[PDB]
Design a protein around this ligand. Sequence first.
Ligand SMILES: CCCCCCCCCCCCCCCCCC(=O)OC[C@H](COP(=O)([O-])OCC[N+](C)(C)C)OC(=O)CCCCCCCCCCCCCCCCC
Ligand SMILES: CCCCCCCCCCCCCCCCCC(=O)OC[C@H](COP(=O)(O)OCCN)OC(=O)CCCCCCCCCCCCCCCCC
Lengths: 115, 347, 83, 174, 318, 98, 114, 70, 99
Amino acid sequence: MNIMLTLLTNVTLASLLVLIAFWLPQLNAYSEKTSPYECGFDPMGSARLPFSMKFFLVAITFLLFDLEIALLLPLPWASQTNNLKTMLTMALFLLILLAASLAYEWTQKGLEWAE
Amino acid sequence: MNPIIYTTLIMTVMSGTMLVMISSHWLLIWIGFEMNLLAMIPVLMKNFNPRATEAATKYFLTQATASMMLMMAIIINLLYSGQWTITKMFNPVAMTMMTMALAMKLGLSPFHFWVPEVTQGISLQAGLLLLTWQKLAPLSVLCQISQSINPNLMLTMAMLSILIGGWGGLNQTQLRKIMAYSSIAHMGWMTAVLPYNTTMTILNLLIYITMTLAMFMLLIHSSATTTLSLSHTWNKMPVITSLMMVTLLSMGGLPPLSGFMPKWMIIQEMTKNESIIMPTLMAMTALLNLYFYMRLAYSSSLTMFPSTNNMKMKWQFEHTKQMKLLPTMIVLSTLVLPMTPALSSLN
Amino acid sequence: AGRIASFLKNAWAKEPVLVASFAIGGLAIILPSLSPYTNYAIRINRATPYNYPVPLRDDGNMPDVPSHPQDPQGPSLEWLKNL
Amino acid sequence: TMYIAFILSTIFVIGFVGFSSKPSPIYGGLGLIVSGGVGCGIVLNFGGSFLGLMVFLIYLGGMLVVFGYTTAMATEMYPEVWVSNKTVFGAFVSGLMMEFCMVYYALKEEEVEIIFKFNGLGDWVIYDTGDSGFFSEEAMGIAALYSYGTWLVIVTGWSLLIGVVVIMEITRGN
Amino acid sequence: MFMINILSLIIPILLAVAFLTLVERKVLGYMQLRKGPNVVGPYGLLQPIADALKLVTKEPLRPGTSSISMFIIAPILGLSLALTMWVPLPMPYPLINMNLGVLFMLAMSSLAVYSILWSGWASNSKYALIGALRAVAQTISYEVTLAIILLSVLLMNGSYTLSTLITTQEHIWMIFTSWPLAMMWFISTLAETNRAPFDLTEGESELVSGFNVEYAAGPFAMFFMAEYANIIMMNAFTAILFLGASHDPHTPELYTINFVLKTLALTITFLWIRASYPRFRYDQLMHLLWKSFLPLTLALCMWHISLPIMTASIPPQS
Amino acid sequence: MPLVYMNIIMAFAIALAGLLMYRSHLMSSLLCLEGMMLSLFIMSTLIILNTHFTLANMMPIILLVFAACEAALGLSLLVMVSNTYGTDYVQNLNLLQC
Amino acid sequence: PGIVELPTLEDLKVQEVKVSSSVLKAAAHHYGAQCDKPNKEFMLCRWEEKDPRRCLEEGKLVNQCALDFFRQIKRHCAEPFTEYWTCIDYSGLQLFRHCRKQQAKFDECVLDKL
Amino acid sequence: MWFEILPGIAVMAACLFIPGMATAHIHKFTNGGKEKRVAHFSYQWNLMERDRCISGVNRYHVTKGLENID
Amino acid sequence: PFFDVQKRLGLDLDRWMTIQSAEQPHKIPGRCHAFEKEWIECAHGIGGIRAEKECKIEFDDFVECLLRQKTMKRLSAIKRQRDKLIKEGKYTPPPHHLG
Ligand SMILES: CCCCCCCCCCCCCCCCCC(=O)OC[C@H](COP(=O)([O-])OCC[N+](C)(C)C)OC(=O)CCCCCCCCCCCCCCCCC
Ligand SMILES: CCCCCCCCCCCCCCCCCC(=O)OC[C@H](COP(=O)(O)OCCN)OC(=O)CCCCCCCCCCCCCCCCC
């Protein structure tokens, strides 16, 4: 299978570039050298900084939009049916429902990056 | 929530249930269960407290696990028959998987643990919806596939449901947990006769839904969720507590009330099948449910508990809203025993 | 009159993207139902021969089935050649 | 080259054992996407090109991606590692050995009866012999969603709109 | 011989990336009234070699708080995806000829978002994770418009086969038929490769270098190679999608010359955007995508489903 | 049945066991749910392609979209629980015992 | 149960039509024009009987009709046909649209000579 | 001035031209001097499998004309 | 269905995907079309109780078509009995089976 050989070659060459990249240089490491970079000082770990419901909401709304996109992908073959009026009605139906989801998220705050 | 959004979510719950009951295709039945759960989760979280959130989370976990098991059963059935039509299952292990999934959705005894916690964690309106409307879809599927169920598995789960609902409800002072354990016992009563006569299952479901609607609407009218809060209701609206007492007596299956009809019909139909030990066990076990119903009746109507000084304020006020169809639900749950032969209309 | 014209004015002045999108979507909704060519597209889809045209046995009284591919019987694609 | 679907399925089950032993959810997600990739490959070997690419684009690049994104936010102060628990090692090892034992039994016996009867005579053996013509039967079946599957589109679109409404109800937090 | 084909695809692409670094630096310099690299070799022609050699001999500081497994997996995934994105491309004849080539590209580019979600998580530092999350959200949000725009454009193609794009654009460019979708697609491609006013994950004046702070020397170099390969690949996809070149079956070199020239023009435009505009804010680009691009994209998908049906111009599916 | 079906059903069983046997994190259980769905998808796809049930080719699409909707709902529930307790640990979901 | 009855190997022997896909495609239109009788008769048998073993002699006649069709092409302008199917053979999709000049002088053969 | 950018662009152009030309010429070399046959659908695959069988040399691209039998 | 709304209203909501012998796009046949058709035509209108015994042969043939279990057993027997005689140097596969 040609595609499998192609994937094997790409992955193998990328990993070989890692190996040369990550083993060839001459090293001399101490504690303060590898300290995390914070513009000249030390970083605070704090406690679970990556928060805020908006980052999760955009992910969820992308997920649902992506599901409707999965429903839209068979469309190029769907236009090859004799029953074109039903197919057009259903494709436009799906797109109105996508637009309705966007509009409902839009009007009910939704897409906003609030205070 | 927005009243329009809440109405839409309620309608989506009912439409998922209807999709379950009108589909001939297993994929559409699974779709109906999915839609019902999706719309149901927000109505559980309507009040939004940590109890409501935990109730919704436990509900979601159990229902999603059951739905995945149901889909696996469908896929095994298709693997061995190529059939999508809801009919007898052509594979025994697929049938077992489907039976366990439907029992977990219903909340039968080995999968009953979610019912008391979720019922306690949600509001009385949410609990009313949970313990009445959510039983329709799995029971309708069971009635459709009843000719292929393993009677031993189903009867085991039903007997365990009756026993656990009786025992668990004995320890409760919370009205929502009492309702949940009563619901477990009544689901056991429904599912015991399912292998023999689905008409008896439909009859028992209708009677139970009438009683549960009446009781939950009386609780909402009373604003009481603990037995002691209900013990104050006599000093405010004694009619409510007397109606509640007759409804509790009906729930206990005491003749001549409506709650005696499903037990009597199910015992008759079971003895028609040389089933005598199990009906005797079931009738004897239901005395536990009747015991804690009678405890509630003692604390609510048959005796008068101490009231509070602040109750005089509530005397000068009426209810802003009135429960719909509550008088009809009360009459139906207590007085319909002379109409029993009408059960053949369900044939 | 002036109310809808003023609303369209404000929308064109402040949200041209939404105006263009709603107009495009509305035309996509409406125009197919008025096109003489939609039936032509249906006919083209019907005239595409994906499967083998398995024949029939002439039991007699089949005067409209051709016999041969080049007999003056059976549907013609002359309409499609000029369209 | 003779057996390709079997290595793919064994790796699939290995990844399932890996993420279902439940290490920290980022490694569980890594195992899940490895399993999803090998399963997309499995259905590619069966002629399900569109379905496998759907697995990729929507499952591995959508649903997962979102899962790992959400794990990257709600995690532990020191986000855990596989090694940190002996329970993870025990579960993974037991799953791997129950995989190995059953695949060896099926390969050398071909009549195992673990719940279902199985015969590892091959996997190419069950393929039918015929021509599909000038179209992909899978694509024609899936494109029938808009002509044959009107009811399916109606209920699925309604459920997706309801899903948007539902997510916005639950996450509001009041 | 097929292995030689794979090699003669991969290696020239990496060389093109290496000299794209030089070309970008020179274009930026000449747009800024300076010259750019003109000392290290003739006209800076040995400068990419100097950069590659210096990087692979520089100490690759790995963080003490880094999960090294994913720390090295992320560059491997990034570069492997960046290289494998070229295997279905129809420089006249593809290396891999699939029915669903553009679907394959969509999937492979959607798998590339893991290299940031894994690099930011692996680097720890508790702050590069936030930049990684911003980058992932931007990437997934613009994936929506990529997918829908590709869907709408391909309704004139009739399939997901990229070779069919050459046939679709035989008499006319697809730009003359879908230019609004072309502008939205081009800006979406700009945003997906974290370029131009969309380079928020590596804002030189916002978060220094964001998710790439902890990476140094070699792994940084491979990440850079992956990004520039993705840039050239996306411009090649744009040229094939919208500016289809005429094909002579007996002289495919003409098509290759045409395609290479158009891909270079689009890449030079990518570098042209970099030198002309300020940087979008994160919320500003999210607003652009969600409230400007998405409604028009939905409307135009509707329009492009309606259009072939109502004009009897539905393409063949073969 | 062929041995690919054996391994796919085995994957479903392993995902079911992993979901039923909980640990601290909620996300791990949700990932087990997702594995159960993925195994169902592959089993359905294999059965549908093998028997050439052409109209049933669309069933895996529907299964995938509906299960992903459920996954979005579960993710939102997890996020609410975490905002309550700072973690997604299921042992904090025990205040309904009383 | 029961024996699947099978034709013998010599019940299955036939003079093969040993020309390639481009040769077959180049003559396909005139082949359909000239060889409709036994072809449609055999396809009728195959759909009516749902049995390969019941239609072997009809397929054997299909083969003979194809063979004689090609022998008729060979004796009058084997050369324009050869050029046409070579040009068809070049392209990787065996397209008709790239060979209209050669199809032209193949078609104005069979009119005048056949 | 600006035309000194052209050397790097020419190097890029050559590096980008190499893949397409190499693919075309390898396809011609390994397919009998003709374009690599495209089989998007099972009918085309079956055409190629028939071509391989009748060639006698197990190569689909060795085309037998009317000189083979007729 | 519990409530056969489809058969009362004449609508085909989900019956079209219910069997593989139903009408298919482009008339693409199911792999077990004839077997399913014969089992359905046997079992039609006599109830499931009767159909389970009186249409057992058709359903068995259908199940064999779907999961070729007995076919796989017979093929496995032929394969493993072939090897059982390769080792002893008994059976030489013929030229058309080796190349
Ligand atoms: C009969 C015909 C029927 C069909 C008709 C179809 C519609 C025709 C008319 C529509 C025209 C507009 C099409 C969409 C344009 C973008 C939409 C949009 O939101 O724009 C405003 C948006 C937002 O603008 P804004 O911020 O001013 O407005 C936002 C909204 N309000 C007004 C409320 C504040 O702007 C952008 O998208 C800016 C992009 C930034 C990057 C700029 C890059 C410059 C270089 C581009 C080079 C060329 C690109 C292509 C190259 C070739 C590719 C092959
Ligand atoms: C045999 C079976 C049935 C047995 C039960 C019959 C009814 C029992 C009623 C309660 C009896 C126990 C309590 C006795 C103490 C006195 C009543 C009480 O608890 O509260 C009294 C109070 C009076 O209210 P009052 O002061 O009149 O209000 C005026 C307006 N402010 O409030 C009241 O008086 C409220 C009374 C409510 C009555 C409810 C009746 C429901 C339906 C009864 C069906 C009976 C069926 C019989 C058999 C049928 C068989 C088919």
